[PDB]
RNA sequence: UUUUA
């Protein structure tokens, strides 16, 4: 029970990016200080790091970092300084650069923006939400289209009334995945049995359920 | 060495 490339035909290219972006790679034991100097501008620049939720259950030499800043002009200045795939902002775009040239210089850091659009949506009719029928989901790329998560949670076992990514860590969008239903059977059976290998011929990932308590 | 409730 798996499928790929069956995502909605809807696309857009007219809007611009938001104040938040991700910065993957950085396996060189650096901290958020690496991005506070990489994106130093005369305007605002604020760091963003989840701090391992203060639990610090692990401490690998690798990790991933983030930032948020009001320079929409610098967001496009660094997305044109970085390069990999200048494709559509519908999650099809991607960029890369590097932070070393004398040690482990065989890699590049991943650079991915976010758009001015809302992070959650569903194609089904709307219904009221409750914490008793929702979940937070991970094991995914930290970023996916809400209309794609709507189709995956609407096709693999039954229908759904809300899906996508939810906003956190700051006043700007995106942070972690979420989905909500109106029946407990379609609820945990779809989001926990979505072991499928999700693909759109330019991205590959999986999804897993996690309770809020 | 690929993403924050």
Whole-angstrom Cα distance, residue A78 to residue A69? 12
Q: Which residues contact A61 (CB under 8 A, 6 or more apart)?
A: A27, A28, A29
Domains of chain A, with CATH numbers?
A: 13-116 (no CATH), 117-213 (3.30.70.330)
Instruction: Give phi and psi for A154, each to the nearest 5.
Output: -105, -10
Q: Which residue is nearest to nucleotide B3 (CA to C1')?
A: A142
Experimental technique behind these coordinates = NMR
Q: Give the DSSP letter string of A37-93.
A: HHT--SS--EEE--GGGGT-----S---EEEE-S-HHHHHHHHTTS-SB---TTTT-
Check if residue A136 sits with its Cβ under 7 angstroms from strand B: yes
Instruction: Give phi and psi for A148, each to the nearest 5.
Output: -85, -40
Angle at A196 between CA A195 and CA A202, to 5 degrees: 130
Output the six-digit token pair for A163: 């899906």
**Contact between A89 and A76 (Cβ < 8 Å):** no
Which uninterrupted H or E stretch holds A18? strand A17-23
Range 70-129, chain A: CB under 7 Å to any strand B atom: 104, 106-107, 110, 112, 114
Check if residue A176 sits with its Cβ under 7 angstroms from strand B: yes
Question: Beta-carbon neighbour count of residue A97 at 10 Å?
Answer: 16
Distance A166 CA to B5 C1' (A): 8
Output the six-digit token pair for A105: 């210089």
Distance A129 CA to B4 C1' (A): 23
Q: Which residue is nearest to nucleotide B5 (CA to C1')?
A: A176
Q: Which residue has the tokens 């809807």?
A: A10
């Amino acid at each position: 029970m798996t499928w790929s490339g069956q995502l909605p035909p809807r696309n857009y290219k007219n809007p611009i990016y938001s104040c938040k972006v991700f910065l993957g790679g950085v396996p060189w034991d650096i901290t958020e200080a690496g991005l506070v100097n990489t994106f130093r501008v005369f305007g605002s620049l604020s760091v963003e790091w989840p701090g391992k939720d203060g639990k610090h259950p692990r401490c690998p030499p690798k990790g991933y970092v983030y930032l948020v800043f009001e320079l929409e002009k610098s967001v496009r200045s660094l997305l044109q300084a970085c390069s990999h795939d200048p494709l559509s902002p519908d999650g099809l775009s991607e960029y890369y650069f590097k932070m070393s040239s004398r040690r482990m210089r065989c890699k590049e850091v991943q650079v991915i923006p976010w758009v001015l659009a809302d992070s959650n949506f569903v194609r089904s009719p709307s219904q009221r939400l409750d914490p008793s029928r929702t979940v937070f989901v991970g094991a995914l790329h930290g970023m996916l289209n809400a209309e794609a998560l709507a189709a995956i949670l609407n096709d693999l076992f039954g229908g759904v009334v809300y899906a996508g990514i939810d906003t956190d860590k700051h006043k700007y969008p995106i942070g972690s995945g979420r989905v909500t239903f109106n029946n407990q059977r379609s609820y945990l059976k779809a989001v926990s049995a979505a072991f499928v290998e999700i693909k759109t011929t330019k991205f590959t990932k999986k999804v897993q359920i996690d309770p809020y308590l």
